[model samples]
Target: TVFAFASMLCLLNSTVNPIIYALRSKDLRHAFRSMFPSAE
Candidate 1:
């Protein structure tokens, strides 16, 4: 049904933050590096 499809789309949207944070925010990338300094 349409409601099921909408729910799935919402879930996808919610799960997109990691990709967005990785791709769209340099500050987040820097913060991640600070957290995991071995990555440097």
Candidate 2:
């Protein structure tokens, strides 16, 4: 049970990885803007 939950969280991190990179990195924010455009 614990191992299954751990693996699930590990796979979930793949989604969060790019989000963290984009918000944390300056150059990536520009590229991310194009891929996922938003208005402020």
Candidate 3:
């Protein structure tokens, strides 16, 4: 169970960076929008 939880936590870690970018970095958000204009 510990191993499974660790694996899940690692998977969740991947999403944290994008969440941080969205929540904390306006510049990253702008660049993302520039890359995908339709996203905006």
Per-model TM-score, in order, reads 0.31, 0.30, 0.31
List, residue by residue over 1-40, the lDDT tens digit for candidate 1: 9887577446643454456653356445545665746645
lDDT of 1: 0.54
Q: Can you tell me which runs of candidate 1 are displaced by over 4 Å?
A: 17-40
Question: Which residue pairs overlap in candidate 2's backbone?
Answer: none
Candidate 2 versus the native: TM-score?
0.30
What do the candidate models score in CA lDDT, each in turn? Answer: 0.54, 0.53, 0.55
- Ranking according to lDDT, highest score first: 3, 1, 2
Candidate 3 lDDT (Cα, 0 to 1): 0.55
Give the Å shift of residue 8 in candidate 1.
Answer: 0.2
Off by over 4 Å in 2: 16-40
Model 3 regions more than 4 Å off:
16-40
Question: For model 2, how does the per-residue alpha-carbon lDDT over 1-40 read when each residue is reduced to its tens digit?
Answer: 9887577446544445456653355345545665646554
Q: Best lDDT goes to which candidate? A: 3
